[PDB]
Amino acid sequence: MKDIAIRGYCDRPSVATGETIRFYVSANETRGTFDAELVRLIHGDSNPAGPGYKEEAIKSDLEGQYPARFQRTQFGSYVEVADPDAGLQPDGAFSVHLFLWSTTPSRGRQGIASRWNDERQSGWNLAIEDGRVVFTIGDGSGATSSVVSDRPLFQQIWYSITGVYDPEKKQLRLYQKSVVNRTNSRFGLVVPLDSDCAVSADATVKAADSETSLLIAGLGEAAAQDGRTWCIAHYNGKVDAPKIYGCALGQDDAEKLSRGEIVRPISRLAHWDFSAGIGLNGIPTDHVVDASGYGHHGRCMNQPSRGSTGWNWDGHEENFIHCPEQYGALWFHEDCLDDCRWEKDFEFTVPEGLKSDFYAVKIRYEDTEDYIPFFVLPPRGTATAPILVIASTLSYLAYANEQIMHKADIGQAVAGHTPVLNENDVELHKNLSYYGLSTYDGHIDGRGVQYTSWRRPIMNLRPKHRQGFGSIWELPADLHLIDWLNHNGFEYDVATEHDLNDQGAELLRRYKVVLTGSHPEYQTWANADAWEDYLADGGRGMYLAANGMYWIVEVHPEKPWVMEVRKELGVTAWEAPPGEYHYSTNGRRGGRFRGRARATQKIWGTGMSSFGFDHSGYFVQMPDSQDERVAWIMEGIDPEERIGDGGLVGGGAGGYELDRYDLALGTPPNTLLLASSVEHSVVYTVIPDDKAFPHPGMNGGEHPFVRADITYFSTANGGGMFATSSISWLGSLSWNDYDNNVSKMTKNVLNQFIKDEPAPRV
């Protein structure tokens, strides 16, 4: 069909004046040129019942023609130990020990530990071939020598594997031993497992210098060109404590290494401890320490999961910062990606007279037309507007390259209909290697994706994209608010949640009112602190969304383009495995905000109540609508009207996500309840956070928790928070050509908050 022929991304989400942003572009093949120009995004939704797509051209130094070329992506987690001087290719006898835990032991050939060239079969490796651990040496002639284990591995069982090369006997040996205990494996000690072997073979050849790096969980593709080794046969599952010896080990040495004893410490050529670097702040680094004392330090590539349960993990401690000796594993999936690592094609330095708004680079290739969005800040330390719009870039990363309808069996069940998918949803399915996975997707192992990255082509971030749950989801849903603010005469600035994480409440206090996106679901702990500190002293805000502070996020300290989330039972897609709840960026718990005594009620007045994606409802006015203290809100609205019966997103104003009033979760006591939503269906459900025992009938129309709630409270020093508690509020702003109750209410509150008089103090 209309296939995607050009891809691209930018290196950073937001850029102030006088700063450089770099744009990395890739084509299907190296031919032709492509065009590029700068646009200002105004509206994104191409629904014929609305305004249609809107953009504006901007003259810049950025535009021109550039050569189109294919750029290759490395895809899959591994550890790369750079060995320039062939020290880890030993000249005589050498032994390799490691602990293993395989999740897909029959998914092709999977290299475990290797200094191995695979173009010419030179070096040594340790790999899984047809479910069996194989230890192979070679010398580049094509002639190799292997030893194959008698016992095929089981899935998710800890094994202790030793490979031995011995020239004195001209012999390859292999030791295998399962080290199951009560908690570390898939099944426990009641199973009479027999997976111990000790096999030998005749090494007719000698191992040669492979001219590659050493790789944990992979094999090297060819000889290194310009110092880069390419990884090919990716392993899935935990590796714990690998080490290389300069001698040949016996069976008593293998038996002692299976119990965790370090035998012959003077003979270790290398020993990588994956738990070295854990303090009370976690392990926020890609650095892998050589514990032998020879400086063969490694580097984690494409972010394998650190702080993972080891081979000796009994469950007496479930926090990896208090028992680092039982957390020496790294998970290593084959479909991870933290950086595409492409070569830059062009870059942009922001001029002085460039307004702070949403921007995109429009790349015009042969028939494919691609966008690359970015965000432009005001000059550093200054504000150029009274209104601040927060772009929800952390939630853009959470839903980045989302593949629910192609992967999740409950995709159509959460929706209330069959999904409608673009060619972008076909392009993600056809080329998974170019893009990666979302945090709502899982790996090929089964565990969900914790880490997501900005430095990759994110295809559901383009403004002409329409998502599968309904109409539109993340950035075109914020272009609704942008188009409403441009149709009226409001002057605004744009910040991101990464900028909020960097700058604190000092960013927010430059503005009289701060607005959120349509779905600001993922926040850091410092963003919640900044919002609370802003509102506690005269700050005003509008929360024009639902599901607004649900999951705790930490931005990675060494790599600020990578986001971490670990999830638990709640409104979730996956659940974290039992001892692995704590983040590795900071050493803290970080599940739901509500489970850390920081529910969304304690800051924004309302918080997560229900979800469902068939259609939307409308709001019905509560008795606080006729209160004299909120006559400024309900100003041009008859007291018997439906608020928001019609809209682009879902067909109404109350829908897709609902937040409610709750004093026990932390609503301020002076909050008024202006309206509440009705006409919700069986597809909407009560969230698992609110259930004790699941009984029948906890769904829309049949349970009191299924509602959205328009609220308002006031804070000290003339501040106040307004909330509408629905995603599809912003999709109802441009209904009936901007002549509706939704835009009247939002405009009344926004004209009140941009004044100099205090917020009206309910």
Partner: protein, 124 residues
């Protein structure tokens, strides 16, 4: 003595087959006892301001929780102009598209509903 994992298998598939058989028989008995739910679905496949009947919702609850390999969806060939019906394949594969084109997406949802009823009738 447990030593080779190819000697063993997931024996819950022997019950998933047994469950699917009873469940497909129940669904075609619902569709035969209440023929009006098909026209109810054709009038409004979203249930917008007229929520679906419990029998139509039971048919939806069967159809929507299936495994994704083999599942039908709608491919927006030209948005608001043309819609086709696709079938999900493995990673790395383009989907198999349908012949017929549809104007709105509600027509495509009802054709997916009819084709799923035909495919559950075909296996029995």
């Amino acid at each position: 003595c447990v030593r080779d994992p190819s000697n063993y298998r997931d024996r819950s598939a022997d019950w998933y087959a047994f469950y699917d058989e009873r469940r497909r028989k129940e669904i075609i008995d619902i569709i035969d006892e209440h023929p009006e739910i098909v026209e109810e679905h054709a009038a409004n496949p979203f249930g917008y301001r007229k929520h679906p009947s419990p029998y139509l919702q039971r048919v939806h609850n069967y159809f929507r929780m299936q495994p994704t390999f083999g599942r039908y969806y709608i491919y927006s060939e030209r948005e608001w102009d043309a819609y086709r019906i696709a079938t999900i394949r493995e990673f790395g594969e383009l989907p198999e598209l349908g012949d017929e084109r549809f104007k709105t997406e509600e027509e495509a949802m009802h054709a997916v509903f009819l084709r799923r009823i035909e495919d559950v009738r075909a296996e029995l």
